[PDB]
Design a binder for this molecule. Structure first.
Ligand SMILES: [Cu+2]
Length: 124
């Protein structure tokens, strides 16, 4: 299955957001991250990807398609706007084994506030 996530300067949840900020997909599904506004990218957050997965980092302004392989929870950020809280979470499959490890990862305050909300929206 294929999904879309947009990067915007302003959304319902405030400035510098991924929409949706929380998404559950199946193993093998693809998500395209699309900078609707210019100046954004997507990168995995350190400490917030499952075992067996490889980190990724897109270029500024490109539409970046990723096929998620290893099951678990992935935290993503926009590189320039991580400190402003521009983050999101993608859960791949049921019963993510690294859910408890990702809740403990360290992030700047505004990002953590939004990651905690996004993790709670997954019923986590
Ligand atoms: Cu950004």
């Amino acid at each position: 299955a294929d999904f879309e996530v947009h990067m915007l300067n302003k959304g319902k949840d405030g400035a510098m957001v991924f929409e949706p900020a929380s998404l559950k997909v199946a193993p093998g599904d693809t998500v395209t991250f699309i900078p609707t506004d210019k100046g954004h990218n997507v990168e995995t957050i350190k400490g917030m990807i499952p075992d067996g997965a490889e980190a990724f980092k897109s270029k500024i302004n490109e539409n970046y398609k990723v096929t998620f392989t290893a099951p678990g929870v992935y935290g993503v950020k926009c590189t320039p706007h991580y400190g402003m809280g521009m983050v999101g979470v993608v859960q791949v499959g049921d019963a993510p084994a690294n859910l408890e490890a990702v809740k403990g990862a360290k992030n700047p305050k505004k990002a953590q506030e939004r990651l905690d909300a996004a993790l709670a929206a997954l019923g986590n």
